[PDB]
C-alpha cells in the first residue's frame with residue numbers, strides 16, 4: 001500500500017493512482033513574484049465559533065482531528081469560493097528535521113510543517129460526493145515554523161501519546177481550531193488536488209501567507225508518532241509530505257498587495 005517510504009512513497013503513487021501525473025496536482029511551489037494580485041478576491045470568512053470536534057485518529061499517514069459535520073457549524077466561505085464549505089477534519093504534514101515538512105513551498109522555501117483544514121462544499125451533500133467534483137473541497141493550508149510555542153496546539157500535542165500507532169483513536173471534544181489561525185488571513189489560491197491518494201482533483205487550495213510558530217518541543221512530539229500499528233516494528237511518522245508538483249496550466253492568485 002502507499003506511504004512515505006523508500007519503496008512506497010510519492011514517486012510510486014502514480015502506478016496505483018495515475019491522476020498523480022494529472023493537470024491539477026498538489027502541492028505546488030508558490031512563486032511569490034509571479035502570483036498575481038487579484039482585486040476581485042474577497043476576504044476569507046472563517047467561522048469556527050460553533051465547531052465541534054469529536055475525535056483524533058492515527059490513520060497510519062497522519063493524525064486527523066475530526067469534526068461533527070452533520071450541522072451547519074464550522075464553515076469557510078468568501079475568499080475565492082462560491083458558496084459554503086463545512087469543516088470535516090484537520091491534519092498536518094511534517095518533517096524529520098525542521099528544515100523540511102511542508103507540502104507547499106514559497107519561493108522554494110520548505111517550512112517545518114503544514115496544517116490542512118479540510119472543508120467540503122455543502123451543495124454536494126457530503127464529503128464523499130464532494131470529492132468527485134472539481135469544486136468539491138476547500139483546503140486551508142497554514143505553514144508552521146519552529147520558534148515560540150503555539151498555546152492552542154498543546155491540547156493536540158498532549159493527546160498524541162494515546163494514539164501512537166496506526167488505527168488508534170481518542171475522544172477529542174471541545175477543541176477550538178481558531179487557536180491554530182495566524183493573525184492575518186492573506187492568502188494565495190489555486191485549483192489543485194488531494195495531496196495523498198486518491199489524489200482527486202477536487203480542491204480549491206487557500207494557502208495563508210503568515211505561518212504560525214510552534215515550539216521545537218511541540219514538533220518533536222509529532223515526530224514520536226508511528227506509521228506502524230501496535231505490535232509492529234517501529235517506523236516513526238516523519239516526512240509525511242508530498243513534494244511540489246508541476247504547476248501546468250495554472251495561475252496562483254494572491255489576495256493581497
Ligand SMILES: Cc1cc(C)n(C(=O)CCNc2ccc(S(N)(=O)=O)cc2)n1
Pocket residue numbers: 116118127128131139193194195196197198
Ligand atoms: C469517504 C471518502 C472518500 C474519499 C475519496 N476519501 C478520501 O479521499 C480520504 C482522503 N481525504 C483527504 C486526503 C488528502 C487531503 S489534503 N492532504 O490534500 O488536505 C484531504 C483529505 N474519503
Ligand SMILES: [Zn+2]
Pocket residue numbers: 091092093116195
Ligand atoms: Zn494534507
